[PDB]
């Protein structure tokens, strides 16, 4: 649903309510301003028409009416300023309150609620929803009330002057209002139509953009493009249809307006000739009622914007309804004083609310005394991390009761409990500040002496000594600037500065070497005597010196006691220890050069539109002229009929002209967007992996540029030409005709024209909005908001809500003041222009009264000059408001030209190279070194070497991140190494054909990803440029043992799978990845983590096809499960990129090295 109206203005103080009341009154005055001017104008032409009697007191009467005009103008100046300022101020203050409350409401939130909610929604929902609320409660409400008052005032003034004419204009007033509203809503910045049309197509893009490396692995660069192109043509067609309808309705509005002119003048002349009404009376009635009925149309976009704001505010109020079930700041919590090391767990059952169907825990009972180093051992999946999280009050347990030193947690304070438990998690995150602040985040008042003692306790001072800015170094995002060991050591320091009572480590020495882990554990025993400690780790070196060792099994703690007790117990831990022992140019036109005819037709119609405002004026003036001259009735009647008929024909010409101009420019614009998007997508696919490595272009640049390139280039060429041509025609010819009829008055008015044009632009731009280009202003605040999400894992040790909230509010302080100032400024400008219109009326007609008094020019001629120039200036401003900006378009087009030129010598579209007819299948690496282009300082390789022969099952064992997938990427022509020599059967890959190597082989990915089609097309993707037989499909499905799961599904080989296979399970998509790779029949086969998520009966049926098909083809398997490693032919072990051991499996098992400690992990 949507919020209530009253809850929208809930955060508004009484001061802001006063602002709203006065702003409403100001808008009502400002709205009643215009029809009164038209009333004065009617009376003024009535005087001018009698001035020449068979000129006396002309200048006097025109002085009187100039005073009237000036007074109305000044009143409107005051009302406009008040109305704008007060509403912008009220909206700004309220939005500041809402941002603060929102950011604070998300802080408490709920444990695991963040995992449920989307990360992108939490960062995006915020800015989008809040900016959408601001627009709805901002000046739009003020303009709505202004329009209402204008409508009522116009109708009242009309009804008072003459009722007969206003009855007819009322009879036609519904259609006028509907037309104005439909015209405006289409014209109300309809960029949402493109995002709606491209919404389907865009999706496909991101799928590709999600996994470019996989799309590189299989031959789908060409196959996806066609799938992208076919999606694109539909949005192209829908857009072309949308442009036809918009222009039809706009032209129909124009026809209706001019038809109302014709009807009003026909009936009004019938009234004037009969003596019922005078001429000025008719002009007053007509223009007042027309303006009112036309402001009813202006009222509508604001109604839509208000509804949209309500819709987006509903969610935010829901967010503040959320309750974490833990009060971080209710000072009603209970705080102990004689805190002593003690842990009590009894009958503890708990499950994750994300997946509540599965029960990990089935009760665990523990009692841990003070100073008792308790280690827990067990394979991954039992919930070591779960107990950790279930220890610092993150979640509450569903069964039992947990206590700490007598009393239970469920009645004491959470924050006081949270500060006293120093915990390091598995993978820590580090705030992107200086390292003095990072290590300061433990507690408030820490001097640099305690800092140094802490870091020296952490033994993380050497790498502090070597780097510059020893306390001022700004660590990069997510610990990317420093190494992992330095990172985990300072994380230990960051925990120790709290001086805790209970210490909880969780995989504290994952990537750490021998001596630093040794000195870390000695420091941990240096500060364990006063505290209770629980340590979780995989290395048994830091475990053997503990107090108590225990073991998880199925969530229940089974084995208890000391080291020797589990030695004589001969359980799983006795099995473990038994086994262990820039440039800017203009080329835009050329991009659209091909579509030369459309523009031509367009240009022509644009000329005619320019000629619609001067021509109007001429006709307009002459009709009034007919009642100024002294003629018999019949002459007045037939001239008036002629000119009214001219109005009708002018409306029809405008209808056809608008239709043609809009149609042709829209057709050319959509064809341009299609061609351009196709070219850019193609070039993105053609680009090298290095181009994808740069983090600017990783997700958002490539996705954004594809939607930003279409919308802009059309504004760069077509809109620019249409608007410049139409304005030049209009203003030029109007000024020329005015020059010829009177030269003094034209110069006088030219002095004032620019103000009227920029006035129209300001008006329309007020309707459109400010676009919120304040990422620079809101930049630090958004950084803080994102880093709170990032460090949400670090929030667990110390919530630090107040610290982040203070940083964020301090960030917001500057935009708030700036925004109040900006609101004042915008009010001043809008008011000045809105008044300058009426001032211009006054001055022009007083100067013209002087002129008529001395017979320098006729009244019809001054009226023609004024009408032409003024109305031309208004139309000029209006037209220049619809055009998009040339600057944005130009910078986009430059980026695009840069994208297309980029060529990383991929050599995928070229045949040239070495093409032998034959091969053997022998690979020889030598002295091969590789450095990532995005990390040029950090080497991950130090010159490995390898020898692979036919059918040689070569295992590659190492730590996580020791150049495992790198050799895959070295083979697959992703990166070409700076140094080294690779001989593929005595044929260097650098001289071969590039696609031939990518054709012969075929691998499985580290993560399985599929495409947005069925599973037949998933497996069919493996083989390209080839007629894919379905017998191979079902044969591969059987060989991968996925046949059963496909034949079990309804619409078996047509079952539509979503993105990345998010419908079916992980093992099944891994198997279908096996099947997809299987149809390649590679002479060289690579497996990377072939059993990451798979059952033990499925691993065998996977490996049987491998074993029967490993013959004849070279096979290279990389995995952590030793099952495929025992049967391998040869085995290579890596350490920081260096080959340490190689040869047969029995040789490495004979000489006990690091591979003996590797294989002997869980066996026995």
């Amino acid at each position, epitope marked *: 649903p949507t919020v209530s109206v009253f809850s929208m203005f809930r955060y508004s103080n009484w001061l802001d309510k006063l602002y709203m009341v006065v702003g409403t009154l100001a808008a009502i005055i400002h709205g009643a301003g215009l029809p009164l001017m038209m009333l004065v104008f009617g009376e003024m032409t009535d005087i001018f028409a009698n001035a020449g009697n*068979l000129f006396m007191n002309l200048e006097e009467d025109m002085t009187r009416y100039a005073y009237y005009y000036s007074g109305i103008g000044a009143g409107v100046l005051v009302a406009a300023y008040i109305q704008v300022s007060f509403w912008c101020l009220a909206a700004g203050r309220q939005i500041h309150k809402i941002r603060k409350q929102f950011f604070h409401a998300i802080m408490r939130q709920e444990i695991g609620w963040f995992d449920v909610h989307d990360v992108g929604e939490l960062n995006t929902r915020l800015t989008d929803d809040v900016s959408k609320i601001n627009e709805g409660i901002g000046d739009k409400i003020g303009m709505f009330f202004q329009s209402m008052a204008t409508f009522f005032t116009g109708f009242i003034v009309g009804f008072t002057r003459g009722w007969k004419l206003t009855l007819v204009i009322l009879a036609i007033s519904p259609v006028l209002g509907l037309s104005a509203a439909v015209w405006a809503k289409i014209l109300s910045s309809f960029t949402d139509k493109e995002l709606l049309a491209y919404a389907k197509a865009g999706a496909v893009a991101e799928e590709v953009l999600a996994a470019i490396r996989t799309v590189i692995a299989f031959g789908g660069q060409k196959k996806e493009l066609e799938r992208y192109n076919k999606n694109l043509e539909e949005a192209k067609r829908i857009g072309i249809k949308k442009a036809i309808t918009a222009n039809i309705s706009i032209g129909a509005a124009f026809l209706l307006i001019y038809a109302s002119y014709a009807l009003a003048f026909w009936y009004g002349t019938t009234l004037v000739l*009969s003596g019922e009404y005078s001429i000025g009376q008719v002009l007053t009635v007509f223009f007042s009622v027309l303006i009112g009925a036309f402001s009813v149309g202006q009222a509508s976009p604001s109604i839509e914007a208000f509804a949209n704001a309500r819709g987006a505010a509903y969610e935010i109020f829901k967010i503040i309804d959320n309750k974490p079930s833990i009060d971080s700041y209710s000072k009603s919590g209970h705080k102990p004083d004689n805190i002593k090391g003690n842990l009590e767990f009894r009958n503890v059952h708990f499950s994750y609310p994300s997946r509540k169907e599965v029960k990990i825990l089935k009760g665990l009972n523990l009692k841990v005394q003070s100073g008792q180093t308790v280690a827990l051992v067990g394979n991954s999946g039992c919930g070591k991390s779960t107990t950790v999280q279930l220890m610092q009050r993150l979640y509450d347990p569903t069964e039992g009761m947990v206590s700490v030193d007598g009393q239970d947690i469920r009645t004491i304070n959470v924050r006081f409990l949270r500060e006293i438990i120093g915990v390091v998690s598995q993978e820590p995150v580090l705030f992107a500040t200086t390292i003095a602040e990072n290590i300061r985040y433990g507690r408030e008042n820490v001097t640099m002496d305690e800092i140094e003692k802490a870091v020296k306790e952490a033994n993380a001072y050497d790498f502090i000594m070597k780097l510059p800015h020893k306390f001022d170094t700004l660590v990069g995002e997510r610990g990317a600037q420093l190494s992992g060991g330095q990172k985990q050591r300072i994380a230990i320091a960051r925990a120790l500065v709290r001086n805790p009572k209970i210490l909880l480590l969780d995989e504290a020495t994952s990537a750490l070497d021998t001596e630093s882990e040794a000195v870390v554990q000695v420091a941990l025993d240096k500060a364990r005597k006063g505290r209770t400690t629980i340590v979780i780790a995989h290395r048994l070196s830091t475990v053997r010196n503990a107090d108590v060792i225990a073991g998880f099994d199925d969530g229940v703690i089974v084995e208890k006691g000391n080291h020797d007790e589990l030695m004589k117990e001969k359980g799983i831990y006795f099995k473990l220890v038994t086994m262990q022992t820039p440039v800017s140019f203009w080329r835009i036109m050329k991009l659209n050069l091909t579509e030369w005819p459309y523009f031509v037709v367009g240009v022509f119609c644009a000329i005619i539109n320019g000629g619609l405002q001067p021509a109007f004026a001429i006709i307009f003036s002459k009709i009034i002229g007919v009642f*100024t*001259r*002294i*003629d*018999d*009735p019949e002459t007045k009647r037939q*001239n008036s009929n002629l000119f009214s008929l001219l109005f009708l024909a002018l409306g029809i010409i405008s209808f056809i002209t608008f239709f043609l101009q809009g149609f042709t420019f829209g057709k050319a614009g959509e064809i341009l967007t299609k061609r351009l998007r196709y070219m850019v997508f193609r070039s993105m696919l053609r680009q090298d992996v290095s181009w994808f490595d740069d983090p600017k272009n990783t997700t958002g640049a490539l996705t954004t540029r594809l939607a930003n390139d279409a919308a802009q280039v059309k504004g760069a060429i077509g809109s620019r030409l249409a608007v410049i041509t139409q304005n030049i025609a209009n203003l030029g010819t109007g000024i020329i005709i005015s020059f010829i009829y009177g030269w003094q008055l034209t110069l006088l008015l030219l002095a004032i024209v620019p103000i009227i044009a920029i006035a129209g632009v300001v008006e329309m731009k007020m309707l459109s909005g400010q676009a919120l280009k304040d990422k620079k202003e809101l930049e630090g605040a958004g950084k803080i908001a994102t880093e709170a999400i990032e460090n949400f894992r670090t929030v667990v040790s110390l919530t630090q809500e107040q610290k982040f909230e203070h940083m964020y509010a301090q960030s917001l302080q500057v935009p708030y003041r700036n925004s109040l100032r900006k609101a004042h400024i915008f009010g001043i400008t809008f008011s000045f222009t809105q008044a300058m219109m009426y001032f211009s009326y006054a001055g022009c007609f007083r100067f013209g009264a002087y002129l008529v008094a001395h017979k320098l020019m006729s009244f019809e001629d001054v009226l023609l000059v004024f009408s032409a120039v003024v109305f031309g200036a208004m139309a000029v401003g209006q037209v220049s408001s619809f055009a998009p900006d040339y600057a944005k378009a130009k910078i986009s087009a430059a980026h695009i030209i840069m994208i297309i030129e980029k060529t990383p010598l991929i050599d995928s579209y070229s045949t040239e190279g070495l093409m032998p007819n034959t091969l053997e299948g022998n690979v020889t690496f030598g002295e091969v070194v590789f450095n990532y282009p995005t990390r040029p300082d950090i080497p991950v390789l130090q010159g490995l070497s390898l020898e692979v022969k036919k059918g040689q099952t070569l295992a590659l064992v190492g730590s996580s991140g020791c150049g495992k997938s790198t050799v895959v990427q070295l083979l697959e022509r992703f990166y070409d190494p700076l140094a080294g020599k690779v001989l593929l059967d005595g044929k260097e890959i650098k001289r071969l054909n590039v696609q031939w190597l990518r054709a012969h082989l075929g691998i499985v990915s580290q993560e399985p990803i599929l495409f947005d089609c069925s599973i037949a097309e998933n497996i069919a993707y493996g083989d390209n440029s080839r007629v894919v037989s379905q017998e191979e499909i079902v044969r591969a499905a059987k060989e991968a043992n996925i046949h059963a799961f496909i034949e079990s599904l309804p619409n078996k080989y047509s079952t539509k799978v979503g993105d990345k296979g998010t419908q079916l399970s992980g093992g099944q998509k891994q198997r279908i990845a096996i099947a997809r790779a299987l149809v390649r029949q590679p002479h060289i086969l690579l497996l990377d983590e072939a059993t990451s998520a798979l059952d033990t009966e499925s691993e065998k049926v996977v490996q049987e096809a491998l074993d029967k098909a490993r013959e004849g083809r070279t096979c290279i398997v990389i995995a952590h499960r030793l099952s495929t490693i025992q049967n391998a032919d040869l085995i290579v072990v890596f350490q920081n990129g260096r080959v340490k051991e190689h040869g047969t499996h029995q040789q490495l098992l004979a000489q006990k090295g690091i591979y003996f400690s590797m294989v002997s992990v869980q066996a026995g």
Partner: antibody
Amino acid sequence: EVILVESGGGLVKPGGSLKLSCAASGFTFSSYTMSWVRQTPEKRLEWVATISSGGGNTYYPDSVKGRFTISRDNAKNNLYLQMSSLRSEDTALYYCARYYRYEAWFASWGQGTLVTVSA
Amino acid sequence: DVLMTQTPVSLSVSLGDQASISCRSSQSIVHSTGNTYLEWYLQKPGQSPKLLIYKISNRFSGVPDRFSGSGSGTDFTLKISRVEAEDLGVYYCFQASHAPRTFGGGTKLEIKR
């Protein structure tokens, strides 16, 4: 005041042609409608022509239509009556007349100029 | 077309007396707008004609008040009360409502002495 002086009257043979002119001073010639009226020697007046202020519309009765023509120079302030295919029933005194507001047809009259058509 | 006939052709009024001229058309003189266009002109001997009443009841600028015009339907009469010796002359009634415009004729006035 309002001064209308017309001239161009002589003797012409039946079936010939003639051209009359009327110069006007003291008012804006281009803002008034102008008429030509004819008075026979039987003291019976008759309407002859009418031209609007712009000169766009021209009204003749169904007795001289197609033979006569009326024209006007607003820059020189002159009114011209071009005649052709004369007749014995055109011997008469011609006045140029002005048009009053409040829908009065003839406010200011000329002096009259005589036109005789015979052999 | 439309013909206008004055009821009297000649009228002899002593100085100080009053008298009325009536101008009857056959077709009713009513324009499409609604106004009725009837004017009365006077031509003194040896002078161009001068406008007397510019709509059945109105009076041109400078016209003396003793001229009084009243008109009903298709019968229209101008009556002068206490006519002076200067005001004698020939009177015509002009009608400009239909597309041919015609004058009446006649109405000679002779002051008795």
